[PDB]
Design an enzyme around this catalytic site. Sequence first.
Site, PDB file in Angstrom:
ATOM      1  N   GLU A  31       0.852  -1.180   0.000  1.00  0.00           N
ATOM      2  CA  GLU A  31       0.000   0.000   0.000  1.00  0.00           C
ATOM      3  C   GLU A  31       0.892   1.236   0.000  1.00  0.00           C
ATOM      4  O   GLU A  31       1.641   1.477   0.950  1.00  0.00           O
ATOM      5  CB  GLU A  31      -0.884   0.012   1.247  1.00  0.00           C
ATOM      6  N   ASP A 103       1.966   1.999   4.487  1.00  0.00           N
ATOM      7  CA  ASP A 103       2.668   3.250   4.781  1.00  0.00           C
ATOM      8  C   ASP A 103       1.956   4.432   4.134  1.00  0.00           C
ATOM      9  O   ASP A 103       1.834   4.589   2.948  1.00  0.00           O
ATOM     10  CB  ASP A 103       4.128   3.193   4.300  1.00  0.00           C
ATOM     11  N   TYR A 318      13.858 -20.687  43.168  1.00  0.00           N
ATOM     12  CA  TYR A 318      14.428 -21.706  44.050  1.00  0.00           C
ATOM     13  C   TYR A 318      15.284 -21.156  45.188  1.00  0.00           C
ATOM     14  O   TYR A 318      15.667 -21.901  46.097  1.00  0.00           O
ATOM     15  CB  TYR A 318      15.246 -22.715  43.233  1.00  0.00           C
TER      16      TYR A 318
END
Lengths: 679, 679
Positions: A31, A103, A318
Amino acid sequence: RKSRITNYPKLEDANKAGTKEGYKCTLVLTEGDSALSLAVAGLAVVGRDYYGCYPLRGKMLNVREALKNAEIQAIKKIMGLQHRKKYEDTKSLRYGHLMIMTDSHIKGLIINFLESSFLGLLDIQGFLLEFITPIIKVSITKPTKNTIAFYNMPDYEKWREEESHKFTWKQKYYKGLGTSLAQEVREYFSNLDRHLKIFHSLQWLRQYEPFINKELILFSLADNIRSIPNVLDGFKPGQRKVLYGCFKKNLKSELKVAQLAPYVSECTAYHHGEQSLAQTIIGLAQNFVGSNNIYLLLPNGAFGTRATGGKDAAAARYIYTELNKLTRKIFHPADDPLYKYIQEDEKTVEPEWYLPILPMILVNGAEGIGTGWSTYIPPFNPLEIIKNIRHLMNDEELEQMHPWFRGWTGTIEEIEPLRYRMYGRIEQIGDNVLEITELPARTWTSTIKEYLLLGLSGNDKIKPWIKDMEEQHDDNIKFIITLSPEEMAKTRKIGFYERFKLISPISLMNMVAFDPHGKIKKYNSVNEILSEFYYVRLEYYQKRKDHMSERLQWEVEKYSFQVKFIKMIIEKELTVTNKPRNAIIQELENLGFPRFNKEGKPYYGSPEELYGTYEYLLGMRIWSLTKERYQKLLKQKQEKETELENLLKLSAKDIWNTDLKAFEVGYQEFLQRDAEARG
Amino acid sequence: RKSRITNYPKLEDANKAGTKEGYKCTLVLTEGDSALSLAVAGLAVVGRDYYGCYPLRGKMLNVREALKNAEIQAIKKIMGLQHRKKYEDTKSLRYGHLMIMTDSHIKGLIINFLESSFLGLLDIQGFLLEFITPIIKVSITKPTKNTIAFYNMPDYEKWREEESHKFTWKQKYYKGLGTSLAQEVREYFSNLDRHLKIFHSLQWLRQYEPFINKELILFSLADNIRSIPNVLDGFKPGQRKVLYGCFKKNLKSELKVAQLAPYVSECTAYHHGEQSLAQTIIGLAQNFVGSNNIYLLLPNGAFGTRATGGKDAAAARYIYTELNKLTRKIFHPADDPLYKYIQEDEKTVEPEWYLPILPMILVNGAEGIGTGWSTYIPPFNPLEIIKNIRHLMNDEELEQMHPWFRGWTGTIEEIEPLRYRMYGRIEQIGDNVLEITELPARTWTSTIKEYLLLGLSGNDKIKPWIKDMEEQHDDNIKFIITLSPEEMAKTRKIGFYERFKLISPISLMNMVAFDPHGKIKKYNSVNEILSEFYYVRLEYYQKRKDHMSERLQWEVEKYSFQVKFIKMIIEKELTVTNKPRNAIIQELENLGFPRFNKEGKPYYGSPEELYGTYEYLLGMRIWSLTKERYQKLLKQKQEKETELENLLKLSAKDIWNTDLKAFEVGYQEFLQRDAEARG
């Protein structure tokens, strides 16, 4: 049998589109003129074999309101989309994927058409695809330089927690705005082509479809702020936020490093560009030889060993951690009201800087690399640091301090000012038998064993010079090495310390930090750092005294008037009973009783929080009127007076040394409790 | 050039070990007779081409203390491990992977040997491997049955949050203990072989190396408890925990569904076997036609639409939610002290059941599938539910209630007791043009469009019967369908509603739930559910009254004695001034002043929390002795007396209807505010 498209001239059909491998091909709809150039730029990298290109739209003169059928036919004809159908596979289509370049509203239109007419299409695994420009880029500098990108924040956050600890990294300046867009598109098509190759071979899969230079300097400032520490506390904003969070939570018991992290992050607006929060926490608690001389946080779990330099630490979940009993003797709570807490988004965060009783940047040292600036300050002996503090308090000459590591046992020598040579220790315990019981401070055991294995079982281009090697490392270092008489003789010639790499340098030529004012500075000596700290600490001890005395005085007045109020009612000089409010407020004011606000400040005279109330009087319990309670009030008053007088007898230096003494006691305890833990 | 191992008879060398493809081969070291049988069992599946097998140890008679060199040589010889070296690749080895089977301390020994002699080995990506038995197994029933396993809790937790919403699932009974171990091993080798095939083709990668039947019934009980709801509130423990968490947090503002979840989970000991917490939250807030008649939580975001039945809901992190303004009028807070809060691990959690003012299980209905039991109860009209509640309060006959959906507009007909036929709506708006403006309640738009597309563009074995179709769905349903005169005639013959699938049944023959006592029950009628609820609610309204009156009475006494105490001091009948503590305690006791504990309960007479204190008197502020304050105390006393009398004038039913009326008002508002939102 390439099904050919003859009615669309602007189409640059992928060579393999319409064939058996059409499901592998990708169609790029563009586009705008600029989107066409970029698609082509990307296609120059991947080729036209598996990629087609078509200008859906050219340029738009009209304005964007919140699909032309000719466009629908184009997409259908080229894609091979036949009729209204529920798609499950893209095996009946000319192309297997569809990419859109804008764009940024046309992508939605295409999406609607596809969902409305062809159901399972957009739900197919890797069918739709789109060009996305990365938001964050990271400079990986250790395992190798490569600038990994992240297209959306969450991807960054996951890598930051689960991967950032493996590479020495930083964020790079990236807008991905204009001139660099061409390469961005190539990188996209390049990465995309890699993914599709593996995606189609396996037919496991990640998905793409799920300036004003002021901002450059703005980025360089933040980087240095994140990278170089402040000279007063030796902290970088990240570590400071953690400590502040620990002081803030009033922690009595331990917490998983995974548990403490989100607390610090929410409570301190911990920036995303910063290092991993858990990693920062683990660094603050590491207690192996070579890490912290005084670890402010306790390593209750595997926080890393001397063997790999803590790189073998367990996961945040842990491991547990809590404040070191000694930390609050270093960071004295009586100093808290003195600090300037930074204001971010209506929330007050950590202080600009903390002011420990002794220079923490000298105790633990610092290390960091920013933009245009870098710093390294080795650890020094806190015992010696305190001695120099006292020399300053008593106007006596300072004694030079050299690097010193907690629990370490080698030797350090000054070759010239600001340059040292650190030695481990190797002695001959028999004929051709040399045992190594110490290595330079920051030399990790893995580095030496691998050097020993290399010389033991020679590599290509270097032949065996060691005969036998044996590790007997309990908690201390101990490499028993045996050599051949000829090699033992060459070890005497080259040198036992040089040959076994038991010498490493220490440079004090790059001791950089932010001064009390926040301006980067390079210190030319350790005493220069200690002195700059000293005058600020000395000042704040006077500030502490003044802050404490002013309040104690206020309490003396409060108790004085409370005793007066009670006593007067006791002796029937004042009656409160059934007397109107305004009558008592006026009566108390006429008798000279001051008002007290929330902070405990008194306000004498006739006029809120600006004036206060008589709530300290009338708000007292009826219990106060009784005997024992009144006598208790008399004792509190007297004890408060004595407390103030006791404080006013002391100077700023008297209080500092009191803290220093309290630290010395706790530090000796920290030392035995630390040697006992890892030994 | 197969390097052959001749000195180890017990070795069943992989055919391709020692060749070029040795890096692809896997060596399975076994310990114990049983581990050998299992390795072999697994090898029967994958073959001996890429897998070798060797009995490291046979059977152990001696006892286990917290590596024989012969074993080290065996491993080295077979693996092709030459000399002390830092490995980076397994290209110079006879085997590419190593697996250990123990039947669990020997794995550590092997690990030590490998790290101590061959550095990078254990750090190589997929080198070490071990047989791990899954902890959790899940029965996926919708997309297809397959019992996916999870070898460690975290893997389960991730799937539960990011994947559980796609499949209709439940946990299956799995110990993976004895007799089933043989198949477990085959499944492991089968999965492992798949991974290695793809791992080596790509040379992205997940890693394996990073009864007493009472427990069967114990599992069936928990499943039914998680699956079938309680008849009183219509909730399943999961939903109840969520609501409880919302009431507990005293939420005023909205929260991300991702934010609310961990809060509910920590605050309610939300079981792991339960459904996804976020999913449970979204279900409670869904407001499309077909979901909740009254959604207790507000859907502030995309919580799912009518098109896919909420299956297209956004991620927990992207959606917000808060309590519906009406929820607290349904779940009356005055009932909170009455509930029996479940005690789990020293923490009190949600109630056994809540007691809404109207049967929520009838308002929204319920659906679930447990073990041996299943349930489905359609939604009913709350307006009609309240009418029946009042019929019961007034000893009037109940009126039959039929299914009813909020915002729905079709028609429901009873074909026979407990069996209905729900219709959508289709009218002919022109010649050969039929428009569909309504579909059966739980029929999702996607289902109809795909049926329309299928008949429009015929599939294999079914030819085109529809001519043209067009969707114009705004927020309401609207399918404009055009047919051929011959098909229009066959639509009249087969039927417009039958042909366009606008008829779906509703069955009330499986309305199951837990009764007030917690024992599963099947209800044979809607009135049966309403009545059982009624008597429990009626009872608790008497309980509420009694709980409220007893406390108000206590307050009446407190104020009465507070006024007495103040008044007596005012008129100098009692003096507190400078009088000893024990003297006042005895004086108050002799005057008949009761003690009050923390809960506000009075204790009269001579003797803690069992007796209370005179703190309600002597703990009063001196302010109380003044004029306005004393007159205020007199007004509080009087107002408390009036408040009690006002309550004692009402019956349990009077209070219930007051709540019912307050609900009616808020519900009409909920209805307009809901039609306004989605319309």
